[PDB]
């Protein structure tokens, strides 16, 4: 991968442990490397099926993330499902 998928990139700035009032709240963090945020569909869809298109290294949530080209619902590619373990390219069903 060179970039993420343009539909799902979003750059929320860091916050080195400062609340809405710019004082120090959670100590010992800040100073790392500029991240982005990959908008994940964390609430499953209406009944459909999809094909795992890839698996991408993800900075925020340790696990890897898999854009799924969807065959139903007209989604035509959602950002992903938190990576299921076994299948690295297979077919899914969010609800029967």
């Amino acid at each position: 991968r060179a970039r993420a998928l343009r539909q799902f990139t979003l750059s929320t700035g860091k916050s080195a442990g400062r609340n809405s009032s710019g004082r120090i709240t959670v100590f010992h963090r800040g100073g790392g490397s500029k991240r982005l945020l990959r908008r994940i569909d964390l609430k499953r869809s209406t009944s459909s099926m999809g094909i795992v298109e890839s698996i991408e290294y993800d900075p925020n949530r340790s696990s890897q993330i898999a854009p799924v080209r969807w065959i139903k619902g007209g989604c035509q590619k959602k950002m992903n499902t938190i990576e299921k373990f076994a299948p690295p390219r297979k077919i899914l069903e969010p609800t029967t």
Partner: peptide
């Protein structure tokens, strides 16, 4: 599986210009 369909869309104008 393309991640960037580009076009006759150009880049780095005010970087090139500065180099020149």
């Amino acid at each position: 599986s393309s991640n960037n369909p580009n076009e006759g869309s150009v880049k780095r104008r005010n970087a090139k210009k500065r180099i020149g």
